[PDB]
Amino acid sequence: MKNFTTYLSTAPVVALIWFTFTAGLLIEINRFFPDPLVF
Amino acid sequence: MFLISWRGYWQELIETLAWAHERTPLANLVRWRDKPVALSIVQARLVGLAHFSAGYILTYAAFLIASTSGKF
Amino acid sequence: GDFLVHHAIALGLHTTTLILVKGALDARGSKLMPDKKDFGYSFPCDGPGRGGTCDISAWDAFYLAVFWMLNTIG
Amino acid sequence: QASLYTHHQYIAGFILCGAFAHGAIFFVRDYDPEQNKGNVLARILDHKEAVISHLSWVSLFLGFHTLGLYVHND
Amino acid sequence: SGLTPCSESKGFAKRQKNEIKALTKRLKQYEEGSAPSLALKATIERTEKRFANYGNAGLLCGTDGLPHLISDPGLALRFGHAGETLIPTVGFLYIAGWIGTAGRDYLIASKGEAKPREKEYIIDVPLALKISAQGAGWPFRVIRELQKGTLLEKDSNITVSPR
Amino acid sequence: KVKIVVDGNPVETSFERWAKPGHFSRTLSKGPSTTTWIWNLHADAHDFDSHTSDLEEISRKVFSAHFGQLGIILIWLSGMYFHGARFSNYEAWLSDPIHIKPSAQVVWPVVGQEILNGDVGGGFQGVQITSGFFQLWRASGITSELQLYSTAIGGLVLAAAMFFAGWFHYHKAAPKLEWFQNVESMLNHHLAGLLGLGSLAWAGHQIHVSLPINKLLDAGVDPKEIPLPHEFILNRDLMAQLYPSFSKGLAPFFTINWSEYSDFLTFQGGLNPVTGGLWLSDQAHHHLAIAVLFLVAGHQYRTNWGIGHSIKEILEAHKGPFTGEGHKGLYEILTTSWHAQLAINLALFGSLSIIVAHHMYSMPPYPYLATDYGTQLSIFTHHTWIGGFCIVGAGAHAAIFMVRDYDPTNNYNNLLDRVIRHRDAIVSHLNWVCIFLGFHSFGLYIHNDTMSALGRPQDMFSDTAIQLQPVFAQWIQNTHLSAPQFTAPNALAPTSPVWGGDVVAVGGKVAAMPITLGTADFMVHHIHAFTIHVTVLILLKGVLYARSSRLIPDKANLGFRFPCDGPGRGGTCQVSAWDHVFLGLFWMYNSLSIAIFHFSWKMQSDVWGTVNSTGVSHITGGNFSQSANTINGWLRDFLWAQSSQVIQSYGSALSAYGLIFLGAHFIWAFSLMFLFSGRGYWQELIESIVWAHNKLKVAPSIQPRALSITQGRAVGVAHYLLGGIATTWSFFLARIIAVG
Amino acid sequence: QQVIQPINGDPFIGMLETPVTSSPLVAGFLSNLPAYRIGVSPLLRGVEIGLVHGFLVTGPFIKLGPLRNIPGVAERAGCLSGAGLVVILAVALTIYGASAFQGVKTELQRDPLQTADGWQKFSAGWLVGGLSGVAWAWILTQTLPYYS
Amino acid sequence: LNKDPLVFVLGFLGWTIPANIGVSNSLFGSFTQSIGENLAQGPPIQDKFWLLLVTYHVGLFLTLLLGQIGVQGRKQGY
């Protein structure tokens, strides 16, 4: 499990997880609050 | 072509061509004075840039003058 | 539209200037080639050693910047 | 009018490239560091990394945001 | 700039009416209650809400009938356009300083390890999450580093090429 | 003696090496000092012979990697069947394949992207597909989403089996080297067992499932009222209703009364007029005959029962007075070099994909494929591109063999040795051929453009001026048109309508028609010959001079992939065989772009279109023969005129193509920064940027480097190809979806 | 039996002897061409070569030139064009000789052609033979029975 | 050429005599009839003379090539 979590901590896996989180957050914000142009 | 392909490809190609001329009957009666070689690295950058720029300018000049003068 | 294209023009001016200025200031030497002044303004490269050194001369910075100038004036 | 504007702007672009080219040539061939010790020329050579890096930053900012606004509008 | 509010712009209203009309023209080829009909009606509802919201935000409209943003901080604050660029500027700068400070903190913390390069491509994920949480208080720490003199490395410790 | 030999449990199954990037390589396992290590890890990941010199370990890695690729392909295929089952208008299209556009992708409503769910018909909204799956599923007899679901589930089970096998044959039971070197056994099994039994089993499916269901479909029966395939399996009388010879059962087969089966094993030729596709009974007979031929072919090679051929003996016997020792030593090469095998197989596989493109457009094998113009254009273009890339790869791995696996001791005066010993003659003659072809192909167009601009159309190379008729191809067309009369008497019709004869029309649209050839066709075919010969010149020159040249006599010591041997000898950039692959990719792109442009314009101008009482109204109205003999004709009447659909696509469901058109133009232009520049500039720029990071104490420990010279070239050509090909992709698809 | 051998038995001169190079028909035919008559004067070999080449070039000019569709004018224009090409090639041959010239065994004397004076006589012979061959081509278009 | 040339009716007649066998006339007979009919202006592109020419000549050339190889290959060792 230690070796597996080290693999999950390699740069592309962390990049995949973080960018999936960020893209999903942006997508769900735009789903819940459609068409934001201004604050 | 001058900007993407670089020198050593052309030098080996020219070597085969120089072999061909020396071995071809009725043509090897004539010889070069200057040994044919590929253009230098810097010369290639220059010549590619010159063709790129001249084509850029000629294309836009034709488009500009034709598009404006065909209407006006 | 004038706003957007003027900022494109600013990008072109600043990038062409960056290439030209970096070429002029690194013309005498850089970390990759600390004795570049000994080789002159225009030379092909310093060979594939030290990672490879294509287009390291200041002349090559001019050559790269002409593309950006043509893009900018375009 | 269109031909004259385009003609003189392309001529201006080529000339500006040449200006910076001959500045680089000056730095290689003619610049004497001992004769310019501590003056404005030597001092701008002495912070060339700051100048180049700031030109890089402004070019990157302009490119990222101008292209991004255009692509968003597209 | 000679603009008009979008809520009183005729071009803005014409654009809303034309977009709704195109979507409604697409609608009259499907039965009611079908998935295409529901999807098109949802798009129509979103279009109407979007035009109403852009009118109600006080956005200015050009002769194109489209919203134009005001970005001078003076004109924005006095005429109620701070939500267009100024407040987004503050929000972006806060998040960007957060990201940069978290990255700097992680790099500095990794510099003291026995194998500093290992943490750069095999991420210390608990440490990264802890540092990422602490990036919320970045302006205070960064301003203190600026006044103290520890934000910047001294020029005598940085490599430079021969001049 | 051919036998199964494995090693038990050679490699432990553990995540320990997953946690150590670059473990496979002795240089890379120590970890990075610079960012170059990050790229080198990916570049060297599948270079097995660089990791070790043991042929057994390399072969085991290759076998298990092939299982992994098969599992990925099965996941992809099951995905396509699943999206047909779940996210498609397939059943509605089955009820009305002439008016309903196939769609099997639906986008979610967010950020306005639901406009891409176009009104494709059948009460359905989605992205229109051009892969041809609907026509393939209909030809197979699939009538419901349940059968598509079943294939998707079965594919995922088989995908898991492939991934299990790759793990199993690497970690548990890894075959030894002598198992892999049983090329006689592998050829016998792949000819008779894979291809032969595959064709026999597919003939079985066609006869028992595809033939009766499609017969009922083309009769006009509603697909929901057609009996399921197993009803045709279990009820022989039901099948005998459609094919009366089935009442006799298998007795005509066993008594050699094969002509009784003539109702479902036919030799009609041509196309089914209802669907515009090839007759499925013809396909059943074709696959049966193919199966028998391959089953016979798989008994040629000696394995364990004395009879059969030794391939080494065959090769060593074929030598002549011109060729020295002939094919001696080739058996040792092809049983010890994986790269030599890859070179051969890539060359033939790519040539096969290109042949497939031509044969499927000319003889459309699926119902309602030929009038789905988007699908026709897409599959031609796709298989052409796959073929070209595979051929360039053949050149690459031939060169890799020459650098790494060639041994002069085992090649003394054989064919390979003698080819190397006159490489200058080969390359110089091919150089002359390329120059001659370029002059007498492209210069004809330049002559025509200049004559037309000067107001001298009578001085042009054209059908109404100085003519260049392709008389040999015209004679071939006439011969193939006249074939059912004399030279193929039991075939009712020619193989394709392209040779001559009448228009095949489906739903008021042309499925296939004669493709006449005039001066413009002559000119563009010699363009094709020129571009193919130049691409051959680059790749073959890379192979022949991979080890040495007059310029660099010790090039093999520098390896397959190296940037140069320095600025000396005038300058030696791109001497490596890898760089010949790099240049050959561009010329492959140029060649295949002209080929697919030729296809698109000629089909739109001379084949595709609507049928009226008067005749055929083609999409671009026959303008190929009028203007394809000038470059300006191509630029205006093809590129400028046909790009109207992609640049007007905004605000429609085709707007994704307009965006991809622009983005692909961008990616293409972006590539020129990598191709035109050099890493010395970029490394110095990075020095200044690194100074800025050092000042703020944000310099990384993994020291940033510019890309290597070779990586700069690889990035440049990858983005060039991606941008150009995706530009043509969006142009083609928007054009033919909107006007098809 | 092997029909490809090193050039003159020397494996290290960059040439191979093949049936194309060294068949008795090919080597006999090439030896009797005027280019390979080493002892014959370069002027007369130039005359023969010029006759052959000036005659042959008129054909494309006659049948494919801009005036090819004008009866009578087509032949005269094609022959004047061929004469212009012959004169241009004479200039090229002459400037080749002035620049190119500033042992051989089977012992052989070197060609008098491969000298400055010999090449200049060759150029004169080329010019005379080429103009004569162009004129003879015109005469043939005016006199051949089945010419069209 | 070092071709070892030998007088070859075995191949001149090794293809022509089998090609003069009547099947549903013969290839050689049809070829000669086409030559005679075309000798009475070049043959058109619809004429069977081209196909008869190509088939007969590829058969004769392959027969001659295989005959030369068989005579020389057996003599020099197979």
Ligand code: CLA
């Ligand atoms: C369209 C063509 C194109 C593009 C986009 C660029 C881009 C760039 N050039 Mg290169 N250039 C080009 C053509 C181009 N060039 C050509 C033909 C030459 C002649 C060889 C050069 C020569 C050149 C020199 C000599 C220099 C540049 C520099 C720059 C930068 C300018 C600053 C900037 O705009 O930052 C913004 C960056 C961009 C606009 C790049 C694209 C950014 C993308 C869109 C970000 C998003 C990526 C996406 C999300 C990732 C998806 C990946 C996917 C697989 C998942 C930028 C990286 C200068 C530089 O490096 O300054 C810092 C520099 O010194 N250029």
Ligand code: CLA
């Ligand atoms: C720790 C992260 C970090 C920080 C604090 C900085 C800071 C700086 N960068 Mg550097 N940069 C980074 C990462 C970082 N960079 C990476 C990963 C790259 C490779 C893409 C670069 C490439 C780069 C260039 C080419 C340039 C800068 C420049 C600059 C300066 C101006 C700001 C800017 O232009 O942003 C622009 C930043 C980018 C375009 C890349 C940012 C990529 C992400 C968003 C940052 C990395 C986040 C990191 C992975 C977080 C991990 C933390 C976590 C484990 C806890 C400033 C000194 C400019 C200059 O020198 O100004 C004087 C300049 O020209 N950067």
Ligand code: CLA
């Ligand atoms: C009749 C016997 C038979 C059949 C049908 C095959 C078929 C195949 N072999 Mg070949 N093989 C055989 C005998 C056979 N082999 C023998 C006797 C040897 C040793 C001399 C080999 C040595 C060999 C090597 C070294 C490789 C292959 C590979 C392949 C695949 C080629 C790519 C392809 O077209 O995939 C088409 C795929 C399908 C049609 C999907 C279904 C495939 C089924 C499930 C497998 C059936 C064949 C298998 C041998 C049956 C045994 C069952 C197993 C549980 C014991 C394909 C699966 C290549 C590879 O891809 O393997 C991973 C490869 O590298 N084979």
Ligand code: CLA
């Ligand atoms: C349109 C762009 C272009 C052009 C014209 C060429 C030209 C050529 N390429 Mg280059 N190439 C290009 C793009 C181009 N390339 C690019 C972008 C790359 C980077 C990948 C390359 C990389 C490349 C490689 C790797 C190779 C070539 C080769 C060739 C030659 C092919 C043989 C031939 O056709 O000769 C005929 C010449 C032409 C068809 C050019 C047009 C000539 C006109 C019609 C004649 C005009 C004569 C003029 C009127 C008389 C002079 C009058 C004037 C002085 C007043 C030819 C010189 C191959 C070669 O060298 O093999 C022999 C070769 O191996 N190219």
Ligand SMILES: CC1=C(C/C=C(\C)CCC[C@H](C)CCC[C@H](C)CCCC(C)C)C(=O)c2ccccc2C1=O
């Ligand atoms: C532009 C260019 C470069 C500069 C390009 C470089 C250095 C590539 C940069 C790639 C990425 C963007 C670097 C950063 C990768 C990190 C993994 C980023 C992490 C940050 C997250 C946001 C993902 C060269 O090095 C070069 C070398 C040789 C010939 C031509 C060229 C050339 O044209």
Ligand SMILES: CC(=O)/C=C/C=C(C)/C=C\[C@H]1[C@H](C)CCCC1(C)C
């Ligand atoms: C607003 C603007 O225009 C310039 C501001 C930046 C500073 C003060 C530059 C840095 C200093 C810090 C305190 C230490 C490094 C060198 C400097 C110049 C003294």
Ligand code: SF4
């Ligand atoms: S490839 Fe680069 S480093 Fe090598 S010789 Fe050419 S320019 Fe110099």
